[PDB]
RNA sequence: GUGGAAGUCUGUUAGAGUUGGUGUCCUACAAUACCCUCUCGUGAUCUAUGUGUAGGGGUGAAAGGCCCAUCGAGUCCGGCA
RNA sequence: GUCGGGUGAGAACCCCGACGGCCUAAUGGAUAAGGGUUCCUCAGCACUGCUGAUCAGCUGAGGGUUAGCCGGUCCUAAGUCAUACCGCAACUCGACUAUGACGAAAUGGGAAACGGGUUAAUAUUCCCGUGCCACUAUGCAGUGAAAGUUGACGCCCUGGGGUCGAUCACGCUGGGCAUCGCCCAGUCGAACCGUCCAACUCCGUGGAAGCCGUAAUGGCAGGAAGCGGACGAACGGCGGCAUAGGGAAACGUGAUUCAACCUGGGGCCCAUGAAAAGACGAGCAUAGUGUCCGUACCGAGAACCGACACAGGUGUCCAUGGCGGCGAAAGCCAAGGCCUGUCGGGAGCAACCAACGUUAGGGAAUUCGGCAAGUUAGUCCCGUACCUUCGGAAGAAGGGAUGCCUGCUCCGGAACGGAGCAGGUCGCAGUGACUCGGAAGCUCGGACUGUCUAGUAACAACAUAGGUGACCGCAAAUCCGCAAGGACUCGUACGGUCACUGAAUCCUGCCCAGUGCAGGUAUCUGAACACCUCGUACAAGAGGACGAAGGACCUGUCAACGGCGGGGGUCUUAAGGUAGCGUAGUACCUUGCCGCAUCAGUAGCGGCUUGCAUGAAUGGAUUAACCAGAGCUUCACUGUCCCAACGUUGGGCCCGGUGAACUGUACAUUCCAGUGCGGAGUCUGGAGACACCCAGGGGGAAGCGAAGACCCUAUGGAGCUUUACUGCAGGCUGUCGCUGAGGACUCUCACUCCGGGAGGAGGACACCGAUAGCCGGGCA
RNA sequence: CGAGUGGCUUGCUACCUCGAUGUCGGUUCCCUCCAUCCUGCCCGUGCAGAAGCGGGCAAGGGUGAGGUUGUUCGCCUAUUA
RNA sequence: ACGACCGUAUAGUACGAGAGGAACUACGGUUGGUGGCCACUGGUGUACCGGUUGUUCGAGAGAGCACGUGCCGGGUAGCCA
């Protein structure tokens, strides 16, 4: 047969790639030699093509103009501050240590400095529970409870845009247009609407897939495929 | 439409031209590469053994 | 409304998009005044026709269940 | 009343598409054409140019469709008498 | 096209004139690509031209393309290349990271040109006139100069400013017509320099507690109106340019609607609508410089692609010429172009065929089927069912009106805009042509728009929103690469990958035995290295101990593959079909039975229903709206039919010119029989038969076309599948090397990641290299 | 029970064609067979008549229109000698 | 190149309890087929004449185009049923 949809994804070619060029900014922490001292101002907000929410542009003290993951609540002329003595009000990136126990928080660092990987899609936010002189454990939107070093920064606040979801696209014509913003080939075809030699579900009289749909962990890229490694499947129980 | 006499009409273009190296009409001027003597690819000239009956 | 969807997309979907876009089309009440002259300028960005202000807010609401949450811890 | 939304309606505007006639043609005007009929026609729209993806690989709203009249594995030459 | 005429040895088709036509988003005008000299002139007809040719895009020779201010050039886009680095056995190969370069001629950004004249052929390029830009030099001014602005931006609605055009009024110039007095053309004049400024924004004054304002939204004591002012627009107005230019002449004035151009307001996004060069910011005089490449022509029913002078295909701009009308529609007509969708002559011109008109009475009897054709039709008024997701159904259906002429009314500033009134009046017919829906009901399917088999399938197939399950905390899941590396990702669970189902509505039962996936696991099984025993002065080899993933075993899981019976009042194998639906697009028996409907209905619909062999996200039922989707009924309509006729146009037939192809073992005027490898013009017997030619519709030559697609055979091929055979990637796991200090543990020094660095996390693991076991149609 | 005739059906066979003899139904148009449905002339009758029933000769002529089904067949209607 | 049917008189007769109900023969008509014909009816009749919409030739008059008649009304001959 020939390679499956998955695999042609690999290959980075135009239809899988996502329209970078059309993006703005690399949404990132700030990089402060020391002192907390760094602060800017809220010049305007922008919408982010890359996230389908609102980002906010920033100009700080030393001349640097560059845009921001902004949490709910933030607005132009606002002064917002970063480093390990701003104050605790949203919009502000500090230490998860110099963070209060109990307060949501979003755009979370993975390892101190990396400029923040966790909670940043349209109003999520984590949860910042335990400190410790070693660990901070923080719960992310997943629900995962994530052991971190207390230095990793974070913002405060909820991530702005909350409530994306909740509106139904309604229409294909929708879909297509949030699709095209994205690194995503749209639409989809079932495996089972195929040819044999084109996915594993494929051929037959009739639609169904061939074998049983969940597959082990071990399967080779190409047959991986269906219900990956699935701990149980349906809703019973 | 017909793959055929009805999509000859938009062939229009220009792709492979005289090429500066060789002078053959196989410049390809898209790719700026020359298919018949690797002027663009190749600093050594394109050849090779299948051109020519295996014994010869 | 959802009017402009003549008898397509069948209820939920549709009653939804009203129930959404009538609270997205109220009258809100700007954080830094206290007029009631918010208005969404675009996804999850709002603004004053009074004073001025652009806010990051929810994306059909200004205010968020969530945003809330924040102010109080 | 105002307003003027809509993968909204009529529509041979342009343009795109191709349902029936199983008409005409079928050593053709044409290796896929002509006519009447018919569909869409502010949108997942149509289009020019540039540009990317190459052969067990692409591309595919999936028909094994398409990748220069070539496709259930292009074309050329070689293996090859 | 026709009649005259011109040229010529020769004229239906080369040229002039008249008459008659054709093209109106094109058959006109300007061009991109592509072509490449096809452009102009002269000379020709052996080639080419669907006939002819004195013609030509043909043959031959000459000639023709002139730019500071049009393009290129320059900038940057998706993206491309080169060099370096790294990989690879290696390269002309290969991803990342650096640097550099390349990447837009109509149609991205962009310093600057207008008017007239001229040639056989060029022309914002030459000439005449006038203007403008950049750079440099000189001089005066200026010391400001880099912040900022601009370049520079989406989709929908809309106001204002406003030129051309068109039209209206009136005057002038010229023309046309000749029952009136009308009808047509013209009435010109740039770039540029100067000047004016609506809109937006802002300032002062003012001081609204209800006013201000809009087409609409809106505005305001955080200061409304009004008043005054700052900034501030057109390819626009105005003046110059201009006793420039152009016109035979006059060489106008006002108006309305207003493309271009300018300037605002509103609305939409799970969509956010380039960048860089450059310009401005930042004066003036004079002078010098402004090189290089493109420039002809076609741009198409003969200059392009399609073997052709091909009925095909092929992008942009002119979308404002008149009447008409809603209209960039029809129809008619200008300007402009054409008679080259290039063979002609003749016969009332038969049969037959292609397009087409009309047909009395009947009216779907035709047919698989109303296929084909027809009916209806524009606008206004009345009026409008079931059903429904309240949106829709709906232009439902049905009923009425509709011209012209006279005089008026209303809305509006007004239109050469719209709505009405009264009277008069003609026709068979007033949307008089043209344009222009036939309607209604039942059933099936997919919800809808959308997609598809370029070239027999447009559908019920795919997609879709919506529903659902799965994997993953990002040094992730998934995927590409041999490697160096890479997509997703300028992304972070309201994410994204992988799958199933397919809007809404009511719902979605029971089964984990098998298979799949996942988790656990005392015990059992489980490879290699290291370790022990035997063996061998070593070794091969035999055995033991230990035991990973995996398996046994146990559990979870069906919106995971799938299953939901026989028997009796349990058995196979886990359960034993629930809600629904049902003779189904699923029902063999089958035209099932009853009903509706018809004269008659294997159809259709409804009920029944033991369902050969329905049934719940292999989704079930059901469903408004939508449909070139499948079946059925009714009204209307009609040459579909009864049953054909007549007519129109092009052919067909005759004549001039041009001039193929298919096909051909031979013989051949056959017919009836017979015979023969059982399907004979040719054998045998008879019959018939004078030769040639024209037209016809095609009985036969098992007619021509294609080494049969069906079927079988071949120790043929290929695509595809799997618990077929053998292997190969890939994933998991143990072991060795990198690898270091003190059956569980600490550390740091390699190595890895994070951090700009300091340093932080991790850490002898991971990565990578080698090997072993398991899984392994992803692949061979 | 026994003897046959036909070559419409079906089955059997594998003789003919696999370098192709275009498969159903229908339609249109032509010729034929008789085992005669009607019509002509007859015989018998359980032949009163009328209407039939059976049989003989006989192929000149006729043998039609429709509803379901692609259907052939057939089922059904109304006409009909 | 003619095939067949219906009707009337025969006859409410023969026959028959009755109900019912013939024929020979002579007539009139229908149907299907056949050959011909066109006074009559009917169709056609882009010969012709009129009406009239749009547009163009200034109006008028008179015309062209609207597919090979713009549409509508009438229709001679001939050809037809
Ligand atoms: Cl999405
Ligand atoms: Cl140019
Ligand atoms: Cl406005
Ligand atoms: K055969
Ligand atoms: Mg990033
Ligand atoms: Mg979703
Ligand atoms: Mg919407
Ligand atoms: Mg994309
Ligand atoms: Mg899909
Ligand atoms: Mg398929
Ligand atoms: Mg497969
Ligand atoms: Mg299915
Ligand atoms: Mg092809
Ligand atoms: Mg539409
Ligand atoms: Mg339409
Ligand atoms: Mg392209
Ligand atoms: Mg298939
Ligand atoms: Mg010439
Ligand atoms: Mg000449
Ligand atoms: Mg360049
Ligand atoms: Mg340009
Ligand atoms: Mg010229
Ligand atoms: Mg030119
Ligand atoms: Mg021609
Ligand atoms: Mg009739
Ligand atoms: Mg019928
Ligand atoms: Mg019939
Ligand atoms: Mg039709
Ligand atoms: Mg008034
Ligand atoms: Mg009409
Ligand atoms: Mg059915
Ligand atoms: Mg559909
Ligand atoms: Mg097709
Ligand atoms: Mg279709
Ligand atoms: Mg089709
Ligand atoms: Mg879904
Ligand atoms: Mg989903
Ligand atoms: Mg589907
Ligand atoms: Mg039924
Ligand atoms: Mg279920
Ligand atoms: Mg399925
Ligand atoms: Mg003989
Ligand atoms: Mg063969
Ligand atoms: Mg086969
Ligand atoms: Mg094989
Ligand atoms: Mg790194
Ligand atoms: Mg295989
Ligand atoms: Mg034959
Ligand atoms: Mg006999
Ligand atoms: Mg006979
Ligand atoms: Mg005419
Ligand atoms: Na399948
Ligand atoms: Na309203
Ligand atoms: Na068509
Ligand atoms: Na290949
Ligand atoms: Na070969
Ligand atoms: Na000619
Ligand atoms: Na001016
Ligand atoms: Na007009
Ligand atoms: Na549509
Ligand atoms: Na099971
Ligand atoms: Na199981
Ligand atoms: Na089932
Ligand atoms: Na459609
Ligand atoms: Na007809
Ligand atoms: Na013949
Ligand atoms: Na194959
Ligand atoms: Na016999
Ligand atoms: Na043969
Ligand atoms: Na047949
Ligand atoms: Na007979
Ligand atoms: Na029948």
Redesign the interface.
């Given at each position: 047969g020939r390679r499956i949809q998955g695999q042609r994804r690999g290959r980075g070619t135009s239809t899988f790639r996502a329209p970078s060029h059309r993006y703005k900014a690399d949404l990132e922490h700030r990089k402060v030699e020391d002192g907390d001292v760094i602060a800017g101002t809220v010049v305007?907000?922008?919408?982010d093509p890359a996230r389908?929410?609102?980002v906010?542009a920033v100009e700080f003290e030393d001349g640097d103009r560059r845009l921001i993951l902004?949490?709910?609540?933030?607005?132009?002329?606002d002064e917002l501050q970063v480093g390990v003595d701003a104050e605790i009000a949203?919009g502000n990136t500090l230490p998860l240590a110099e963070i209060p126990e109990?307060?949501?928080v979003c755009n979370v660092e993975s390892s101190p400095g990396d400029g923040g990987k966790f909670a940043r899609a349209?109003?999520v936010?984590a949860q910042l529970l335990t400190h410790d002189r070693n660990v901070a454990v923080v719960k992310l939107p997943s629900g995962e409870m994530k052991r971190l070093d207390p230095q990793c920064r974070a913002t405060?606040?909820?991530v702005?845009?909350?409530?994306?979801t909740?509106?139904?696209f309604?229409?294909a014509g929708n879909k297509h247009h949030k699709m095209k913003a994205r690194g995503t080939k749209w639409p989809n075809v079932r495996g089972v609407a195929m040819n044999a030699v084109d996915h594993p579900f494929g051929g037959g009289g009739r639609q169904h897939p061939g074998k049983p749909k969940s597959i082990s962990r071990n399967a080779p890229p190409g047959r991986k495929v269906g219900d990956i490694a699935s701990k149980r499947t349906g809703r019973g129980g | 439409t017909g793959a055929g006499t009805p999509s000859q009409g938009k062939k229009n273009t220009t792709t492979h031209t005289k090429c500066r190296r060789c002078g053959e009409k196989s410049y390809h001027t898209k790719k700026k590469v020359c298919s018949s003597c690797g002027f663009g690819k190749s600093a050594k000239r394109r050849d090779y053994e299948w051109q020519s009956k295996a014994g010869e | 409304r959802t009017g402009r969807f003549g008898p397509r997309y069948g209820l939920k979907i549709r009653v939804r998009v009203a129930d959404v876009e009538i609270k997205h089309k109220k009258k809100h009440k700007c954080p830094v005044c206290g007029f009631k002259k918010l208005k969404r300028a675009g996804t999850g960005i709002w603004m004053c026709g009074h004073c001025g202000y652009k806010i990051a807010g929810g994306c059909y609401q200004p205010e968020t269940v969530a945003g809330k949450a924040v102010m109080k811890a």
């Open positions: 305007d907000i922008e919408h389908s929410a609102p906010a902004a949490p709910e609540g933030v607005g132009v002329g949203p109990g307060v949501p349209s109003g936010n405060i606040g909820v702005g845009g909350g409530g994306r909740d509106k139904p309604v229409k | - | -």
